UniProtKB/Swiss-Prot annotation:
This is Rho GTPase-activating protein 5. The pG1 pseudoGTPase domain does not bind GTP. May interact with RASA1/p120GAP. It comes from Homo sapiens (Human). The chain holds residues 1245 to 1456 of 1502 of the full protein. Signal peptide: none annotated. It is found in: Cytoplasm; Cell membrane. Detected in skin fibroblasts (at protein level). The gene is ARHGAP5.
Length: 219
């Protein structure tokens, strides 16, 4: 006899910027007809609201970054994760939510709707301005359109209690400007137009309800 074991040995593989078969594929592929909106996003949105929507600058202030690391990682290795169970800091979940949009292979807003969004934002008639933006947002991809709406739907809630999260529709519209649209550092190489863009985004949120909800025109 005298049968004794010694154990086993091995070495882990390599690691690159990231490892996932989703990043490469477009959202349209990642998501399904049944659920066009990505869980990750929702889980992050519904979470914040559930854990109270009065977190000082949920987006403006993130605090730690490591928190987001596990948020995306753990979620990657396990889609059945429970943010609540982790008991992380709202600020964290907030950032992780955006990061996703930043990873997207393409910008939420297409280049074929850049001038269309501004041309409808510079409109004099307040009402018309909302209508044009309500009809233009219809051209938005049937995959991103759903999300874009869900996201904003939450922002509006944050702007309401800005007195707490010190964040208004305008502030949020800017804090999301990066992802929503990531132009080239050299955006001044050509004629510069009035800061109408910022207004566009901000507007959508402010009047994000009137669009469908038909809520009175707020100010």
């Amino acid at each position: 006899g005298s049968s004794g074991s010694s154990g086993k040995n091995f070495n882990p593989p390599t690691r690159r910027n990231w490892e996932s078969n989703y990043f490469g594929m477009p959202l349209q592929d990642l998501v399904t007809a049944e659920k066009p909106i990505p869980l990750f996003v929702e889980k992050c949105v519904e979470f914040i609201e559930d854990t109270g929507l009065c977190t000082e600058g949920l987006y403006r202030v993130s605090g730690n970054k490591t928190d987001q690391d596990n948020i995306q990682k753990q979620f990657d290795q396990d889609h059945n994760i429970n943010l609540v169970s982790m008991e992380v800091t709202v600020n964290a979940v907030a950032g992780a939510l955006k990061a996703f949009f930043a990873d997207l292979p393409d910008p939420l807003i297409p280049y074929s709707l850049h001038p269309e969004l501004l041309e409808a934002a510079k409109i004099p008639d307040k009402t018309e301005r909302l209508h044009a933006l309500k009809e233009i947002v219809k051209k938005f991809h049937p995959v991103n359109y759903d999300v874009f709406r869900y996201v904003i739907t939450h922002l509006n809630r944050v702007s309401q209690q800005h007195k707490i999260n010190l964040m208004t529709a305008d502030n949020l519209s800017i804090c999301f400007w990066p992802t929503l649209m990531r132009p080239d550092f050299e955006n001044r190489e050509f004629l510069s137009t009035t800061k109408i863009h910022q207004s566009v985004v901000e507007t959508f949120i402010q009047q994000c309800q009137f669009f469908f909800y038909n809520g009175e025109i707020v100010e």
